[PDB]
Coordinates of C-alpha atoms and ligand atoms in Angstrom, one line a residue:
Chain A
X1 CA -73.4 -19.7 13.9
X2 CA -75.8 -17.2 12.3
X3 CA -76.7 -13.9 13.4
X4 CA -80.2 -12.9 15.6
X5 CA -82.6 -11.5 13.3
X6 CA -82.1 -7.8 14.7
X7 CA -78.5 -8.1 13.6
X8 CA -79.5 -9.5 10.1
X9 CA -81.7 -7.2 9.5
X10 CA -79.0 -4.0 10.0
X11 CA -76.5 -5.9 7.9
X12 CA -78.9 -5.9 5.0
X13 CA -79.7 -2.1 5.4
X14 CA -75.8 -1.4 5.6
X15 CA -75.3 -3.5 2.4
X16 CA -78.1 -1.8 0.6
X17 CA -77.0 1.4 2.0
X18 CA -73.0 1.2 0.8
X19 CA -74.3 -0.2 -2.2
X20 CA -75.8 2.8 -3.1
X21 CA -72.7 4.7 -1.9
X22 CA -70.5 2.6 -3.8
X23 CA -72.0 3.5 -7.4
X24 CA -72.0 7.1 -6.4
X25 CA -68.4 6.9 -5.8
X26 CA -67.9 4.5 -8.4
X27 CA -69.4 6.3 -11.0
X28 CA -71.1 9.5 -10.5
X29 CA -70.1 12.9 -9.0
X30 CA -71.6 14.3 -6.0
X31 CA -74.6 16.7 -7.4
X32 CA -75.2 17.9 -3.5
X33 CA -72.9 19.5 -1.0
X34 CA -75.1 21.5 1.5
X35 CA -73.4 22.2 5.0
X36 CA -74.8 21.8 8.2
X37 CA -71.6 23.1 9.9
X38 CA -68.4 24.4 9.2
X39 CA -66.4 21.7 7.8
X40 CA -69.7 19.5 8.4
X41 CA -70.7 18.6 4.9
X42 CA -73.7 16.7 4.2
X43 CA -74.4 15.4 0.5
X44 CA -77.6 13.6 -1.7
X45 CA -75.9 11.0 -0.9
X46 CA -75.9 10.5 3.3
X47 CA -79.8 11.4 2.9
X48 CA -80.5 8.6 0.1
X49 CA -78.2 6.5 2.7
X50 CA -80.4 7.2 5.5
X51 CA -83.6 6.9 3.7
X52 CA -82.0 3.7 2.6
X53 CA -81.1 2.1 5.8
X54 CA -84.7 3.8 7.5
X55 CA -86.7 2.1 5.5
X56 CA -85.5 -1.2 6.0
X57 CA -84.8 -0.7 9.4
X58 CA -88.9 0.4 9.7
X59 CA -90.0 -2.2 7.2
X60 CA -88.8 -5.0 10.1
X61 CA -89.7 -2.9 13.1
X62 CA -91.9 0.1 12.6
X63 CA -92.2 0.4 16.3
X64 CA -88.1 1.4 17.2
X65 CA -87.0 4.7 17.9
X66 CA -84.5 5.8 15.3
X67 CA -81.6 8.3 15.7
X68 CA -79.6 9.0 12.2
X69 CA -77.5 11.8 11.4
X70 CA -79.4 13.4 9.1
X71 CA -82.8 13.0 10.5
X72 CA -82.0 13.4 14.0
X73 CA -83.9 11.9 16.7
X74 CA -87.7 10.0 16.3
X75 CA -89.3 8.1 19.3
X76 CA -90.5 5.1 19.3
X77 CA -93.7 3.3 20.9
X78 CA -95.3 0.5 23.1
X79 CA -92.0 -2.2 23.4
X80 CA -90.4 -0.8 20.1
X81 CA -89.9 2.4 22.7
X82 CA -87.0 0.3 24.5
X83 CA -85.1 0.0 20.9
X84 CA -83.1 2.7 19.5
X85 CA -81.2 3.0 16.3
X86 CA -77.9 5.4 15.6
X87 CA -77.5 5.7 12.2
X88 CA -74.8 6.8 10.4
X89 CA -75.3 6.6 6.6
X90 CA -72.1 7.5 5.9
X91 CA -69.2 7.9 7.9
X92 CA -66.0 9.6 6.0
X93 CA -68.1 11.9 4.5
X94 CA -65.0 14.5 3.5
X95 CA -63.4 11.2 2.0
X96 CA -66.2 10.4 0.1
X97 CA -66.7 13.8 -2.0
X98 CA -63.2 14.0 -2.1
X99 CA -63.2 11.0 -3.6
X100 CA -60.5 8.9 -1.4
X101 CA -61.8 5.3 -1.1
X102 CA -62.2 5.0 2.6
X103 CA -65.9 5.6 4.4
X104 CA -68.5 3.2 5.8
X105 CA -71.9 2.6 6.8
X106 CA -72.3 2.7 10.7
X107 CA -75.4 1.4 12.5
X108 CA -76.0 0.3 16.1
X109 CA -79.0 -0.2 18.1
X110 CA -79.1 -0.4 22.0
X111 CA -82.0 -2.2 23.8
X112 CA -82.3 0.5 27.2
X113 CA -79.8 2.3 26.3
X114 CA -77.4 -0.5 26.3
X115 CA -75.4 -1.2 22.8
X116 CA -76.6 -4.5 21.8
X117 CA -76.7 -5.6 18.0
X118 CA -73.4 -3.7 15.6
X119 CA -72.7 -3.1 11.7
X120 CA -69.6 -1.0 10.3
X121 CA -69.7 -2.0 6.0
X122 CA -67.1 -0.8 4.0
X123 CA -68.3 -0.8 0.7
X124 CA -65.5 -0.6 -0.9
X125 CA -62.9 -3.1 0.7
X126 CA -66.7 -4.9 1.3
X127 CA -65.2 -5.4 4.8
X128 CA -69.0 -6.5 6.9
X129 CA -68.0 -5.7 11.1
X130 CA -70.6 -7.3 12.7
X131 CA -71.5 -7.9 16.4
X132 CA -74.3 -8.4 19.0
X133 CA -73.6 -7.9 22.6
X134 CA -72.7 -11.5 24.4
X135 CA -71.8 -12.6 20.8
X136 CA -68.5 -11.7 19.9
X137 CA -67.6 -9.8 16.8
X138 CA -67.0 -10.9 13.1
X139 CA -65.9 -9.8 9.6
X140 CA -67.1 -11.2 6.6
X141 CA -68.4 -14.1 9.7
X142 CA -64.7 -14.9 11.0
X143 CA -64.2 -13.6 14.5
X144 CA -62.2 -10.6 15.6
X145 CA -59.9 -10.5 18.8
X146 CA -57.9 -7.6 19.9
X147 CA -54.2 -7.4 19.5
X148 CA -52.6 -8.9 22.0
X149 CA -49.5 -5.6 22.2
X150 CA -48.5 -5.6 25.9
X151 CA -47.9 -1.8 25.7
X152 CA -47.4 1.2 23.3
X153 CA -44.0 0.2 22.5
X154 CA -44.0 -1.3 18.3
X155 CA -48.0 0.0 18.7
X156 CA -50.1 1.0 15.8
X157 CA -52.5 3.6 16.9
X158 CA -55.3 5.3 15.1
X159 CA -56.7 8.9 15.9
X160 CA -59.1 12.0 15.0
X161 CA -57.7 15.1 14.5
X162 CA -59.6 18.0 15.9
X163 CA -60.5 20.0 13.0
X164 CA -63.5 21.7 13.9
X165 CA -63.0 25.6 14.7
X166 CA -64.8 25.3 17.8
X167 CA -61.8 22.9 18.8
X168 CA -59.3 25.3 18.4
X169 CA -58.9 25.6 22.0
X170 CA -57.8 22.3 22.2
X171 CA -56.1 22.0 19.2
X172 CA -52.2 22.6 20.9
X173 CA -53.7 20.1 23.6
X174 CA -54.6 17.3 21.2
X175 CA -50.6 18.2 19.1
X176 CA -49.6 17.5 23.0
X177 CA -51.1 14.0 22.9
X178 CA -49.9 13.0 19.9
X179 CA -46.5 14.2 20.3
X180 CA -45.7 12.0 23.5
X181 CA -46.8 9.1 21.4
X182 CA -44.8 9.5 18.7
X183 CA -41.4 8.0 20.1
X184 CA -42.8 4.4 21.9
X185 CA -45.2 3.7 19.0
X186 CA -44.4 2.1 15.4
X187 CA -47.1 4.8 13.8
X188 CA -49.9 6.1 14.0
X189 CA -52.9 6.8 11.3
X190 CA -55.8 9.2 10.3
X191 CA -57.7 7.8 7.7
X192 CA -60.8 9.7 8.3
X193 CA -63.7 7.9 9.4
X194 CA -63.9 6.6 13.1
X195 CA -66.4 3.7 12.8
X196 CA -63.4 1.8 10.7
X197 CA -61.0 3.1 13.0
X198 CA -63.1 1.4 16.0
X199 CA -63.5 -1.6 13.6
X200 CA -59.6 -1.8 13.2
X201 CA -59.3 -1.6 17.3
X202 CA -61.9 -4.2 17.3
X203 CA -60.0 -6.5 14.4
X204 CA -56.5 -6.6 16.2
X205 CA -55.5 -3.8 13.1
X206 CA -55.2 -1.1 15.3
X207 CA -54.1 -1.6 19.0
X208 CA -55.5 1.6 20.2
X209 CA -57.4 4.8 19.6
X210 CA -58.6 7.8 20.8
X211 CA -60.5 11.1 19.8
X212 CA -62.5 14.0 20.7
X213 CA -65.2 16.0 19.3
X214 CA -67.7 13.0 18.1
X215 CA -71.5 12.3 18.1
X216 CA -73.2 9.1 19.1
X217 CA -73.5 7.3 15.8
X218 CA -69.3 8.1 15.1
X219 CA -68.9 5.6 17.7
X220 CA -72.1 3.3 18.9
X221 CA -71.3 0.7 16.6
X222 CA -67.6 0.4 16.6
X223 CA -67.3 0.4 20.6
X224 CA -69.9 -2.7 20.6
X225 CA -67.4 -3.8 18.3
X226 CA -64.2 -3.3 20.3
X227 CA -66.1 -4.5 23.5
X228 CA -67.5 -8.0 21.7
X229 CA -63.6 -8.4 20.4
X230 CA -62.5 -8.3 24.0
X231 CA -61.1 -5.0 24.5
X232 CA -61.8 -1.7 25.8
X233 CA -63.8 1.7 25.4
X234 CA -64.0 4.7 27.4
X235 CA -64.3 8.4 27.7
X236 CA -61.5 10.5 28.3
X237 CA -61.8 9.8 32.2
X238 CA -62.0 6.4 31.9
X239 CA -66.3 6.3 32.7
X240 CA -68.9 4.9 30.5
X241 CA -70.5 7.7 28.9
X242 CA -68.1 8.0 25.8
X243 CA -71.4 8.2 23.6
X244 CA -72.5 11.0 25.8
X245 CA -69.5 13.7 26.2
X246 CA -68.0 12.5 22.6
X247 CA -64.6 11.4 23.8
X248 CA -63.4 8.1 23.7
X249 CA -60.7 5.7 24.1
X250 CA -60.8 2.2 23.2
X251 CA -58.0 0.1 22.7
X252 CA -56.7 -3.8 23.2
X253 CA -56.8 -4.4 27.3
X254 CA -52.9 -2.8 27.8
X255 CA -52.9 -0.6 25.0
X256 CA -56.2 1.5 26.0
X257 CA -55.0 1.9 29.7
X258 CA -51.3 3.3 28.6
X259 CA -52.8 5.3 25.8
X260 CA -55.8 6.4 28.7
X261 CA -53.0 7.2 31.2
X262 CA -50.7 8.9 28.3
X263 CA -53.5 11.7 27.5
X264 CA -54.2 12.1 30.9
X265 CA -51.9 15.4 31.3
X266 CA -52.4 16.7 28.1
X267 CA -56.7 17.3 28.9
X268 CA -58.2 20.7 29.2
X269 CA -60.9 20.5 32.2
X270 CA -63.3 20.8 29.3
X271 CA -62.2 17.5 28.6
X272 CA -62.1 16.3 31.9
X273 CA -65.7 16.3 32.9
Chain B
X1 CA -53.0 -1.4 -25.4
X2 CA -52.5 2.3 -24.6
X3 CA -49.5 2.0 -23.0
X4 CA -46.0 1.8 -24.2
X5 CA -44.5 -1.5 -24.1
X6 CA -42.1 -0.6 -21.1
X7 CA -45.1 0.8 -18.8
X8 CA -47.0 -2.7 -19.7
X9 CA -44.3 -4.8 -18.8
X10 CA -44.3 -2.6 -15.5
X11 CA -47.9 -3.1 -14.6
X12 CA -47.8 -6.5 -15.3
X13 CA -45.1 -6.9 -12.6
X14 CA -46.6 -4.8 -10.1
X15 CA -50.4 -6.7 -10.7
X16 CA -48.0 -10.3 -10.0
X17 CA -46.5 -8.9 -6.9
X18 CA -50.2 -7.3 -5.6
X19 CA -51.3 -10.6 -6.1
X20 CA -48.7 -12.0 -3.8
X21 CA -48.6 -9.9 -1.5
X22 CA -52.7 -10.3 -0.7
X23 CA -52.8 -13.8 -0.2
X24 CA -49.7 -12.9 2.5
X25 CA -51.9 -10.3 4.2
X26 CA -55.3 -12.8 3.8
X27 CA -52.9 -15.4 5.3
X28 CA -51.6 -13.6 7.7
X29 CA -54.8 -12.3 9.1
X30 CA -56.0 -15.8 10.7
X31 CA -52.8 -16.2 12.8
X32 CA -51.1 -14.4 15.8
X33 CA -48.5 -12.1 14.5
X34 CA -45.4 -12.6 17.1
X35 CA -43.5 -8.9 18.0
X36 CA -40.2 -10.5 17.3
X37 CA -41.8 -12.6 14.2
X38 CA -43.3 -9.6 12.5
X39 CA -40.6 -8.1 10.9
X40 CA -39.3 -11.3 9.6
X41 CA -42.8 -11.9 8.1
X42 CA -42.5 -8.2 6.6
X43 CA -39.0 -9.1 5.2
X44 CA -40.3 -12.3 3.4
X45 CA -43.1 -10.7 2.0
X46 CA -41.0 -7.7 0.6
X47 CA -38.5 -9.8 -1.0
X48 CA -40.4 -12.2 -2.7
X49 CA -42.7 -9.2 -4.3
X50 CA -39.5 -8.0 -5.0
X51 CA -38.4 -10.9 -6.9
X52 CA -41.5 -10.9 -8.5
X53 CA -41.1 -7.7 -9.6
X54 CA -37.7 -7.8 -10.9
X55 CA -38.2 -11.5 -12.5
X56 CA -40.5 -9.9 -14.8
X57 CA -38.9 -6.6 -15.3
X58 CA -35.6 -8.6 -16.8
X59 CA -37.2 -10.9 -18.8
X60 CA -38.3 -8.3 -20.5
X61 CA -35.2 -6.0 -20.4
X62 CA -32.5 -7.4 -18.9
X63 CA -29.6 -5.2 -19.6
X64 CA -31.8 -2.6 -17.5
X65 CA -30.4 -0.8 -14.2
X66 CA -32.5 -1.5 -11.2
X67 CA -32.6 -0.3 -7.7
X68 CA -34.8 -2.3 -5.4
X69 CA -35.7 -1.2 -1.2
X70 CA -34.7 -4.9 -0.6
X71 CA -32.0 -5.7 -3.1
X72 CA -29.9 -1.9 -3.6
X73 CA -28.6 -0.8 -6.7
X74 CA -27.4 -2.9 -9.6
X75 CA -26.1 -1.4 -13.1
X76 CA -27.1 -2.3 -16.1
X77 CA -25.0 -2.5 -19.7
X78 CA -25.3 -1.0 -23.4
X79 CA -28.0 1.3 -23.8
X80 CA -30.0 -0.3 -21.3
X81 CA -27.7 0.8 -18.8
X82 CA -29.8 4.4 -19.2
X83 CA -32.6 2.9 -17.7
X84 CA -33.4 2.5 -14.1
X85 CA -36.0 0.8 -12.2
X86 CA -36.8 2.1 -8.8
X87 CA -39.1 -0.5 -7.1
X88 CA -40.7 0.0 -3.4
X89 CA -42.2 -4.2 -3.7
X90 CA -44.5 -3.1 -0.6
X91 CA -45.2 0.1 0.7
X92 CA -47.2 0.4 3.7
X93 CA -45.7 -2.4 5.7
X94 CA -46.3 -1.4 8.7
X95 CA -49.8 -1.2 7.9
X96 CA -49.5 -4.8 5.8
X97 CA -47.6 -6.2 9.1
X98 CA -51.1 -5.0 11.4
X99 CA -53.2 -6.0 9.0
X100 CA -54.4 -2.3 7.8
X101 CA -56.0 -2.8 3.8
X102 CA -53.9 0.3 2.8
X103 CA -50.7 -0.5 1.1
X104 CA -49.2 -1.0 -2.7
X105 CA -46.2 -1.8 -4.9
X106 CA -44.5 1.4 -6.4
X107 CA -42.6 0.6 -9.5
X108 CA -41.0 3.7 -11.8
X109 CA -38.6 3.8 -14.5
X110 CA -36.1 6.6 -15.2
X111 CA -34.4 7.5 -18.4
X112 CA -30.6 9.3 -18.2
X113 CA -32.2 10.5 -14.5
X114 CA -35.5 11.6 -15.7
X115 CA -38.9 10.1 -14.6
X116 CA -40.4 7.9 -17.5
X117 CA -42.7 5.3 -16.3
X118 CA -44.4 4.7 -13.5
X119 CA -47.4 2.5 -11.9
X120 CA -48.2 2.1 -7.9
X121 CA -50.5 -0.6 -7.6
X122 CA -53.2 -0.5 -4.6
X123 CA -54.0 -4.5 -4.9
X124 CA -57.1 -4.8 -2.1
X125 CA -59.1 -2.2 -3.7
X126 CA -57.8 -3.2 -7.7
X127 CA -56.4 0.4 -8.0
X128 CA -53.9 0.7 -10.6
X129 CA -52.4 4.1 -10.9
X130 CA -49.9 4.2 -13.8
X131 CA -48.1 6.8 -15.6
X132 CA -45.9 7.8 -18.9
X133 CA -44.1 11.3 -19.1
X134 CA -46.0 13.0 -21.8
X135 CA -48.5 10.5 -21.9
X136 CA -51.0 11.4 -18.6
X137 CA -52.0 9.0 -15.9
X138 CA -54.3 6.7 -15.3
X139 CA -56.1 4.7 -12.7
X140 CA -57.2 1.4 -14.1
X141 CA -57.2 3.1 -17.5
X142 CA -59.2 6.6 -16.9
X143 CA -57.7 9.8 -17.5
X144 CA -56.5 11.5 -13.8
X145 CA -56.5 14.8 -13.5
X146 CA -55.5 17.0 -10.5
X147 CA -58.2 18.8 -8.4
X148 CA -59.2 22.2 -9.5
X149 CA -59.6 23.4 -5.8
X150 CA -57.9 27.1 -5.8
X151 CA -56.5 27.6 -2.4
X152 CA -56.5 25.6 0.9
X153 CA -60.0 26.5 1.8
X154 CA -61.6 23.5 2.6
X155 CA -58.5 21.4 0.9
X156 CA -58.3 17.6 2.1
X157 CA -54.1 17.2 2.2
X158 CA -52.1 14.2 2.8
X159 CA -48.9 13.7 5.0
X160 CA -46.6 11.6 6.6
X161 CA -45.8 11.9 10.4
X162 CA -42.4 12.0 11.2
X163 CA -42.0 8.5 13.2
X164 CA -38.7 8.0 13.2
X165 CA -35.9 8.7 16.0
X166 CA -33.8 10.2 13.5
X167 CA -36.3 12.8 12.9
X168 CA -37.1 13.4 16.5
X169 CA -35.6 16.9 16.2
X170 CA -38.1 17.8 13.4
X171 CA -40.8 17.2 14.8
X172 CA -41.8 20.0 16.8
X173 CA -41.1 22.0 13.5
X174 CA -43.8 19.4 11.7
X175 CA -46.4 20.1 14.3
X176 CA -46.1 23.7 13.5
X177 CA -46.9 23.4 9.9
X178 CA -49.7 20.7 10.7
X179 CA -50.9 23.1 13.0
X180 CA -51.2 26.3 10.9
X181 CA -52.9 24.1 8.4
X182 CA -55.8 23.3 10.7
X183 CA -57.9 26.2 10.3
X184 CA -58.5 26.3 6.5
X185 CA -58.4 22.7 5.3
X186 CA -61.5 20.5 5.8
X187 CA -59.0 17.8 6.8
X188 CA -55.8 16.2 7.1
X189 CA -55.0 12.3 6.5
X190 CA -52.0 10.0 7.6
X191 CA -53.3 6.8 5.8
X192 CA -49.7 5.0 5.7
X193 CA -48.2 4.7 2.1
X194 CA -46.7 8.0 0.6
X195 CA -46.9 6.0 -2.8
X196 CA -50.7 5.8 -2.4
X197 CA -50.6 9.4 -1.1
X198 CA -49.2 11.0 -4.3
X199 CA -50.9 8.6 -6.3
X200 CA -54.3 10.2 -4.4
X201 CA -52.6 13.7 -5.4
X202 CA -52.9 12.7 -8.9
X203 CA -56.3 11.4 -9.3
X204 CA -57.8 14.6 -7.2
X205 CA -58.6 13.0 -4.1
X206 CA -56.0 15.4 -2.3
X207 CA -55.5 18.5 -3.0
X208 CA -51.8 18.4 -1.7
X209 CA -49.3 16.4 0.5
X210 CA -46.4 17.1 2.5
X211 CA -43.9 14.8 4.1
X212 CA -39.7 14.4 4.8
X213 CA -37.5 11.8 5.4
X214 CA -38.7 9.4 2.1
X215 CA -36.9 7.7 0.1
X216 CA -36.7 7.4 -3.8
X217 CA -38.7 4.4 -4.1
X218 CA -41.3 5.3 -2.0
X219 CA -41.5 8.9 -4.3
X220 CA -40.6 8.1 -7.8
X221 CA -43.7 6.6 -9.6
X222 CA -46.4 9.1 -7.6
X223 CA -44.4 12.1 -8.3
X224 CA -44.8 10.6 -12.2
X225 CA -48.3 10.2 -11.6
X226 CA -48.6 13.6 -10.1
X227 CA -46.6 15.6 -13.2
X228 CA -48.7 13.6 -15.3
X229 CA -51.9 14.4 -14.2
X230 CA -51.0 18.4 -14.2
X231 CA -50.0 18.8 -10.5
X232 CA -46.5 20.0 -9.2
X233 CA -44.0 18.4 -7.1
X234 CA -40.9 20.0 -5.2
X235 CA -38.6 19.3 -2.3
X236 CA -39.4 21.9 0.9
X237 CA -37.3 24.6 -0.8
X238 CA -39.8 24.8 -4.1
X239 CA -36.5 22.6 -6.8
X240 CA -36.7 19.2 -8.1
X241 CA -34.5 17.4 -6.1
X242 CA -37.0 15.8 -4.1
X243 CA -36.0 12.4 -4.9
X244 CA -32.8 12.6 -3.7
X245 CA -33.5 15.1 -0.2
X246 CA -36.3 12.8 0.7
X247 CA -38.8 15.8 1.8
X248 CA -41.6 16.2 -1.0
X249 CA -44.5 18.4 -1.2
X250 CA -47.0 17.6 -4.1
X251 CA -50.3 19.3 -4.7
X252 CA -52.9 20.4 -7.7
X253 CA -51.1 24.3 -8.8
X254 CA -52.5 26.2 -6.6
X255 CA -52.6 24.3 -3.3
X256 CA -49.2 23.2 -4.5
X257 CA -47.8 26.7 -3.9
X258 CA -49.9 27.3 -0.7
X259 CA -48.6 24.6 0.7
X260 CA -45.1 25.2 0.0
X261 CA -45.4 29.1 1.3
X262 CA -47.2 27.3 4.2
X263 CA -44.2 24.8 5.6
X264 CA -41.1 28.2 4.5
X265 CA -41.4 29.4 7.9
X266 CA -40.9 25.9 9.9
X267 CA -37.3 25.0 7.9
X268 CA -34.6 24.7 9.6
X269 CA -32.5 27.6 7.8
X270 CA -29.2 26.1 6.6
X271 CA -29.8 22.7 4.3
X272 CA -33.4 23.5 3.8
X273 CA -33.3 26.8 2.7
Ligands
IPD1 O1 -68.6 13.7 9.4 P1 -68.4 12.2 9.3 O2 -67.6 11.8 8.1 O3 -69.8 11.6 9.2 O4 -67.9 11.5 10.8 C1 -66.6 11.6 11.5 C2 -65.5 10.9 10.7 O5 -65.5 9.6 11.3 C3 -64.1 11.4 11.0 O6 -63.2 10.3 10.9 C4 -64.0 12.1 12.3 O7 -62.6 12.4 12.6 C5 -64.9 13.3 12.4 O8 -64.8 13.8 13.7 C6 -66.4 12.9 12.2 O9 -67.1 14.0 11.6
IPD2 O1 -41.5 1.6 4.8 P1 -42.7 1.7 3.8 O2 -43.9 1.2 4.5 O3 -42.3 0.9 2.6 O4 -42.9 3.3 3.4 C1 -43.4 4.3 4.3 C2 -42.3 5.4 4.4 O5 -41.2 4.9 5.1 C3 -42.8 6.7 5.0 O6 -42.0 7.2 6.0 C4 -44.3 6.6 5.5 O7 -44.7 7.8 5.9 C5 -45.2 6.1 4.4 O8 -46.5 6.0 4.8 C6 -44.7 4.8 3.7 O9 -44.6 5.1 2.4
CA3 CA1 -70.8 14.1 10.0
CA4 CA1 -69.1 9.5 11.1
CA5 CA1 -71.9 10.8 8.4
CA6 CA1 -41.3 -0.7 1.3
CA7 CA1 -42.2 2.8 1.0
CL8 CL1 -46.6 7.4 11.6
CL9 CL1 -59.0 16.1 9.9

């Protein structure tokens, strides 16, 4: 079956969008590094991303509230009001102006503040996530299922390291988590951006993963994608509001409840709100 | 056409296996990977790129040692007994056996013990990293150099987690050198293929990598690459017997030597000294 139209239309901004970033990587340097934050980089190139993906994105539905990462957040009106984009132009930004082959275009949109329509691109790999809520999840159009791992025993896991200084606090917490993971589980990988990590949850490449610290567009896309591949996405408690408080496990149906149980003792109350 | 004969003959092999190997993983994508089957489908898949490999190496010099992952050690005769392959057909199979994209055949060729060609292939993204001792490295026939970053400020390093039982008693010591590098890098990445790691070393994408318990296939043609491009390459106690103690730490020169002061304090004093 084809995609709705709303779907369609994001896959053709990420395309255009990790087009661009693709000959940037494949052939230019980086002629911008500003810094928002420390250890926050932005570059030329998430801005000509954004402007990318914005103007398509407008060009279909001018009336949509929008919500990138660079340009923050811009209301909507009349009906378009109950639309709202999160827009990351590019996710794996330290990857990218180092160089290492691994980033992707991330762009969700929620109808009431529900996830409904999904794209994670990888340029590179030109791996297309797709998803709409009800609808399943796809690459390149074939359909993703979880893993079917019973528990973390042979699991492959993905995670975010906390590398922010403002996370120091929890840095010897998060080492805590990961080191009472190390013995059941067959390995477990950082490649640096967590919309493909979510997509690899969602594709039955990773069985689980979890990570602290993240903003709205990190993860909008990729947990419509886990949920439309049957699994499972929570906070750090185990509630909904992952996108909100910026910690999140998701995970095939075992996997993300031992992996959820697992970190329980190692949270800070911080982390437990 | 640049290359020597031998390195040619090399990456000719390597781009045969690639080849194989990604239908396996295309193949192997569309059906449910059994727990108890997946490590006969790994040992398939890593001995026929193996034969691959070594078909071709042989019909080209086939008095020639070589010293496959799958196959061991076999000598060779006349002069060609001074030459020694050192094949990894697939590394990164736990990755390949999930289904991760990140993962590539690591051919190198030693002369009387010393490094002399090498080539790790990446064959989903077409990367061919390949190198000749005093002839530079490549990837997919450009000039690599290492990064010119000048300490670990903002540094992007590679590693390898210590997974395995037999390392169980290291790895508190690991998460102490992980840890200390947390505050001045921009980031650290477990991506799954040390190959791919050093061969990331060489091309500038990290500024340095870490990891113990290797083996010599899985280390011989990056730590080429490496040299080649101008970087340095040591065991944990800063001589060259890395390919023999399995712990490695590669970098650009100066993030080289910062890293190396970095993991002194976290050895075990005895062996590692
Ligand atoms: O900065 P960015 O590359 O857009 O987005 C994120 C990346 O997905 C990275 O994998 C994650 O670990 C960081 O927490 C985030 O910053
Ligand atoms: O078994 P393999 O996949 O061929 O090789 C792996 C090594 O065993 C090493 O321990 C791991 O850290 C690397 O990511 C891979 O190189
Ligand atoms: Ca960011
Ligand atoms: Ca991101
Ligand atoms: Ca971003
Ligand atoms: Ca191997
Ligand atoms: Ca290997
Ligand atoms: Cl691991
Ligand atoms: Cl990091």
């Amino acid at each position: 079956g084809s995609m709705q139209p709303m779907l369609n239309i994001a896959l053709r901004a990420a395309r255009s969008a990790g087009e661009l970033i693709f000959r940037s990587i494949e052939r230019l340097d980086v002629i911008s590094v500003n810094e928002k934050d420390a250890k926050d980089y932005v570059t030329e190139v998430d801005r000509a991303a954004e402007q990318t993906i914005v103007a398509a994105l407008r060009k279909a539905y001018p009336t949509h509230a929008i919500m990138g990462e660079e340009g923050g957040l811009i209301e909507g009106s009349g009906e378009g009001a109950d639309y709202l984009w999160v827009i990351d132009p590019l996710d794996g930004t330290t990857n990218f102006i180092h160089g290492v082959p691994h980033f992707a275009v991330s762009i969700a949109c929620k109808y009431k503040g529900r996830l409904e329509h999904a794209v994670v691109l990888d340029p590179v790999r030109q791996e297309e996530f797709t998803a709409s809520r009800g609808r399943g999840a796809a690459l390149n159009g074939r359909r993703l299922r979880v893993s079917g791992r019973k528990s973390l025993e042979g699991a492959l896991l993905g995670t975010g390291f906390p590398f922010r200084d403002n996370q120091i606090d929890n840095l010897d917490n998060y080492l805590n988590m990961f080191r009472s993971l190390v013995g059941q589980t067959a390995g477990i990988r950082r490649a640096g951006a967590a919309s493909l990590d979510l997509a690899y949850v969602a594709a039955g490449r990773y069985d689980a993963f979890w990570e602290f610290g993240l903003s709205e567009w990190d993860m909008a896309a990729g947990a419509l994608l886990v949920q439309e591949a049957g699994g499972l996405v929570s906070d750090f408690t185990g509630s909904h509001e992952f996108l909100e408080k910026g910690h999140i496990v998701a995970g095939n149906t075992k996997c993300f409840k031992a992996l959820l149980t697992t970190i329980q003792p190692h949270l800070p109350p911080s982390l437990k709100r």
